[model samples]
Target: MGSITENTSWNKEFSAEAVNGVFVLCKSSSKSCATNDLARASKEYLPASTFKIPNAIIGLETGVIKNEHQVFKWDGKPRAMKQWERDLTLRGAIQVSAVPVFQQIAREVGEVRMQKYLKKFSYGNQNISGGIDKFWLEGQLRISAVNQVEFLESLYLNKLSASKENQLIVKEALVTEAAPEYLVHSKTGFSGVGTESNPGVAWWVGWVEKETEVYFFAFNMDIDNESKLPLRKSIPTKIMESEGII
Candidate 1:
C-alpha cells in the first residue's frame, strides 16, 4: 500500500529521517521503517537475519561462546554455507551473520529454553504480549518500532545478562570500525523472494551509537518479486550515503 508518489520524491522521503521510526540518541541518530503505515505498528516482516540476535543470546547463556574467538567446526555440507567454509567461532558466525549456525544453535538450545527466556524477559508477540507457546518457531516473534527502540535501550544499559556480547556482534556488522565512535550494533534481513504468495521484504534492525549517543532501530520494506535490497543497495547504506549519516 505504501508506494512512491509523484508529489513526494521517494528517494528523498525514503531517507532514514523520513521513515516511520525515530531514535534521538545523542548527536548520532537513525530512523527506520518501510513506510509511515508501518511506523505506527512497527510490524514484523519475516525477520531475516535480524533474528540472529536472540540466537546469539541463547549461545552466550549456554556457554557456547566466551567472546568472539570461539569456533565451531563445519563439515563442508550444503545449506550451512560459510564464507570460509571451515571452523568458525561464535564471533565468526556473527560476523558473517550465518543463518545455519544460528539456526543450528537455536535447535540445540531447544524451544523450551528459548521460550523460558522469552517469557522471563517479556519478549515476543506484542499483540499477545506474553504467554508464548513457541519461541524460535511459530512465526510469533513480533517486534514493533517502539519495541526495537526499547530493546536497544535495555541492551545499552546492560539490562540482559549477555547483552554486551550480543551488542558487540551487532556493531561488527554495521560499522567498519574506523568510525570515531563505535556507531551501532545491529543486523539486517530479507524476506522470501522465490515464493509466489509473498511480496518480499528487507530488514535493518540494530542499535546505533557515536560517542555518548546510542539507540536501536528496525526498518522493513515490502517490494515486488525478485527485488531484494542487498547490502550496498540496502536502505540504510543508501540513505546514510545520501544524507551524510556516515
Candidate 2:
C-alpha cells in the first residue's frame, strides 16, 4: 500500500461505459501503482483467455510447442469463433485469442505440470480442481488484477522460476502494440455473464515499455452484455493514456 495510490477519477471511464470495474497500473522501478478501484483491484475472477500468457509459457517449456512459429493445424471443423478455425502458430493463436489452440496446449501440459508451473509462477489461487483444460476458464482458479500484474512483472523480469528462453519467447509472442514511442505486450479475456452461472468478467492485462520504464496493468469489468466488450480495453487504454504511459 506504500507505493499504490488511488485515482478515483478513473471511475468516470467506468461511469461513461455504464459498467463497474477496476484498473491498476504499476511502475517497474518503484513498484508504485495507480488504481481506480482499490478494493476490487485485488479481487479475484476467472482468467478467461488471459491465461494464454502463462499457458503459452508452460507450453513452450514442456515442449508442447516448439516455438511461436510452430503451427497447430485446424481440423476443418466449425469453432466457437471463426478466427479459431484455422491453422495457427503460437503467435497467430494469441492474436486471435484462439481458445481451442490454447486448450489443446493446456491439455498436453497436463494437470501435473500445469499445477507445478502455476505454483512456480505464483499464479492466482493455483486451483485446477475443475478440469485441466477448462480451469482457467470456469474452474476454481481465480486471480486478482494485482496478482495478474505481479505474474506479468515476474514474466517480464524473467524471474518466474521458468526458463528464461521460454519466458522471452512468450514475452515476444504477447506483443500486441508496437509503436515508435512504446511497445505493449498484452492479452485479453472474457467469460459469459449469465450462461452456466459464470462470473462473466472481461480482462485486458499486460505491460508497456517506454524508454527506461516499464508499466504493468490489469483491468477487468463486469460483462453485463456483449455490447460492453470494448470497454475492457478502452477504459484501461484511456487510463493509461491519462497517466502518460502510452
Candidate 3:
C-alpha cells in the first residue's frame, strides 16, 4: 500500500451510478497507485473474461493456440451470443469475449500448463481447481482491482515471463479505443450477465497510452442487471477525464 493513495473524490461518481465498487489506476512510469475504495480495491473477486488477457498470452506462449490469426472453427452450435457461433480467430474471439473458443484454448492449455502460467503470472490466488475451463468463471481463482492493474502493467512493460512478440499480440488485441494521441487497451467481463439469479462482478480493465505516458486501470462493480452494465466503462471514463488522464 506504500504507493497507493485513497481517492475518495471518485465516490460521487459511483454514487451517480448507484453502484458500489472499486477503480484502481496506476501510472506505469511512476508506479503510483490510486483507488476510490481502498478496501474493495484490494479485495479479490472472480476474474471472469478479464482473465482472457493472460489466458491469451499463455495460449500463445505455450503454443496451445498457434497465433492471433489461427482460426477456431465453429461447431455451428447454439451459444449465448450469436456472434460466437461462427468461426473466430484469436483476435475475433477475444474481441467478442467468446466463451467457447477460450474454453477450447484453456482445455488445450490443460490443467498443468494453465496452473504453471497462472503461478508464473502470480495471478490472483493461482487456483484452478474446479476445472480448467470454468475455474476462472465460477471457481477458485480470484484477483483484486489493484492486482488486475499490476498484471496489465507487466503486460504493458513486457515484464511477464512470456515472449515479447506474444505479449504484443495480446496487447494490441485489447485495443478497444484508439485515437491519434492515445490508445485504450481494455477488456470487459461479466460473470452473470444474462441472469438475474445472481448479482455478478463486472470488470473493465486495461491501460491507456498517450504519447510517452501510459496509465493502467482496473475497474469492477456489482451488477445485477444489464441496464447498469454500461456504467462499468462510462463511470471510469468520466473519472479518467476528471483526472486529465484520458
lDDT of each: 0.51, 0.87, 0.88
- Per-prediction TM-score: 0.69, 0.95, 0.95
**Which lDDT tens digits does candidate 3 get at residues 75-175?**
87798899898988788889999998888889999999999999999899999999888998989899998788878888888999999999999988888
lDDT tens readout by residue for model 1, 97-160: 6666776676676667776765544454523222232232235466554455455555556575
lDDT for position 186 in model 2: 91
- lDDT of each residue in 103-182, candidate 2, tens digit only: 89998999999999889888889998899879988789999998998888888889888789989988888998887878
Clashing pairs in 3: none
lDDT of 3: 0.88
RMSD of 1: 6.4
TM-score of 2: 0.95
Model 2 segments beyond 4 Å from truth?
A: 195-199
Clashing pairs in 1: 70-89, 71-89, 72-88, 170-185, 170-186, 171-185, 183-209
- Model 1 — TM-score against the truth? 0.69
User: Candidate 2 clashing pairs?
Assistant: none
